[PDB]
Amino acid sequence: HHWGYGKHNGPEHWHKDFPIAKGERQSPVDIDTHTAKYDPSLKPLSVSYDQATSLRILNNGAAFNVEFDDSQDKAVLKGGPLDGTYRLIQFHFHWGSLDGQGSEHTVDKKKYAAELHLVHWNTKYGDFGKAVQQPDGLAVLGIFLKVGSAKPGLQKVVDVLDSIKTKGKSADFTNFDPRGLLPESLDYWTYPGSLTTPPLLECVTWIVLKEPISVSSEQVLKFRKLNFNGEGEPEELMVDNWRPAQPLKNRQIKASFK
Ligand SMILES: [Hg+2]
Ligand SMILES: [Zn+2]
Numbered sequence: 001h002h003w004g005y006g007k008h009n010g011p012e013h014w015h016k017d018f019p020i021a022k023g024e025r026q027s028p029v030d031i032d033t034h035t036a037k038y039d040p041s042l043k044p045l046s047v048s049y050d051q052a053t054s055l056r057i058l059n060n061g062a063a064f065n066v067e068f069d070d071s072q073d074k075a076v077l078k079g080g081p082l083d084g085t086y087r088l089i090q091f092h093f094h095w096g097s098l099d100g101q102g103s104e105h106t107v108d109k110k111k112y113a114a115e116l117h118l119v120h121w122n123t124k125y126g127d128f129g130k131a132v133q134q135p136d137g138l139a140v141l142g143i144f145l146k147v148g149s150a151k152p153g154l155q156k157v158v159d160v161l162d163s164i165k166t167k168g169k170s171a172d173f174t175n176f177d178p179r180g181l182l183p184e185s186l187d188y189w190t191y192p193g194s195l196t197t198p199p200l201l202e203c204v205t206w207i208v209l210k211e212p213i214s215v216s217s218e219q220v221l222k223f224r225k226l227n228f229n230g231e232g233e234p235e236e237l238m239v240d241n242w243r244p245a246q247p248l249k250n251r252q253i254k255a256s257f258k
Contacts, residue, residue, distance in 0.1 A: 003198050004228065005062075011243045018198045025202045026246040027193030028104035031253055036189055039254035045080035045186050045207065047141070052088060054176035057160055061167035061228060062197055063092040063241055066157065066176060070121070070128075075178065077120045077139055080207055080256065081190045086120035086139040089128055091178060093117070094196070095223045097239035099147045102220075104196050104242045105208050107144075112212055113220055114145035115242070116181060117196075137203035138195075143183065144212035151215045153180020158222045167230040183211035187257040196243045210257070 003009050003017065015021035052075035056067045067090045068075060075088035095114035096102030103112035118141040121131035131137035156176055163171045187210045194202040226238035 005241050014198055014200065018200050020194070020200050020202065023194065023200070023202055024249050025192050025194055025251060026200065027196050027204065027206060028106070028243060028245055029191065029193065029248050029251075029253070030106045030109055030245040031189050031208065033108050036253040036255045038258045039081075039256065042081055042190070042254065042256050043079045045188065045256065046076075046078040047182065047186065048078070049075045049088070049177070049179045051075060052176075052178055054173050054178070056170050057157070057164060057173035058170040059164040059167055059226060059238075061230075063094060063238070064161065064164060064226065065090045065092045066173055066178075073123065076123075077118075077141060077207075080188065081205055081254065082139055082207075083136070085123045087123055088118060088120050088178070091116060091118040091181075093145070093223065094242040095145075095220060095239065096242065097224065097237075099217070099220070101240065102242055103144055104245075105142055105144075105206075106245055112144040113147045114215070114223070116143040116145060116213075117141070118143075118178065132195075132201050132203050134203055135192075136205060139205045139207060142206060142208040143181065144209070145215050145220070146212045147217050147220060148214040149216065150219055151181065151213055153177065154215055154219055158219050161222055161226060165225070165231075166227045166233075169231070181213065183209060183213045185209070185211040187211065187255075189253050189255050191251055191253045193251075 053069040103115040125131040
């Protein structure tokens with residue numbers, strides 16, 4: 001009986017095995033746009049993905065991860081509220097059973113159809129494992145997804161989902177360019193937070209883009225065909241794999257614009 005998104009093992013149950021669930025800097029959070037403050041101290045954000053080397057896509061039972069080669073400085077995130085260089089290790093999404101929900105962060109309580117998380121670790125810590133033992137070990141770039149026109153750069157991901165339908169399945173996924181998932185603007189909100197799935201470690205500097213990307217109904221509908229279960233087990237559609245907004249507590253959300 002492990003954690004999940006159901007009635008008996010969902011987000012409201014996580015604190016029992018992971019006490020930090022009720023911590024001081026948990027994510028996601030609602031982004032109250034009128035409370036956020038423009039921060040002049042924020043340096044320009046740098047997203048360098050031209051050398052990104054994707055390797056595989058995996059259904060881990062919670063979502064599907066597109067993994068990258070992080071043995072060298074290729075795809076990195078720098079600038080903004082960040083000090084140093086953060087290396088891309090994987091990206092995944094969170095989505096709902098309907099277009100009206102799915103995102104983890106919300107904007108003035110608005111829920112988007114999905115949310116993309118590009119996960120990076122601080123290179124000064126040597127590895128992802130050591131990085132998650134530091135308060136500034138990770139940087140996650142969050143991007144909202146709304147339903148409308150199709151996102152060409154997402155189609156290659158959508159088309160391979162049929163090959164990793166169940167938990168534990170993986171497939172080669174080389175030469176995928178994450179630059180095709182980014183909106184035009186890099187305006188963002190930033191705050192200190194945590195991982196949104198167990199172990200819910202508080203080592204994340206969150207950078208959430210204001211501009212969402214548009215994906216087609218057809219594209220997100222295929223996300224909903226994935227399974228939480230493993231092959232040969234009763235089918236449980238992988239939907240609503242998102243954690244709700246958590247208490248902001250002693251934190252302030254800063255804006256890079258205005
Ligand atoms: Hg940490
Ligand atoms: Zn996530």
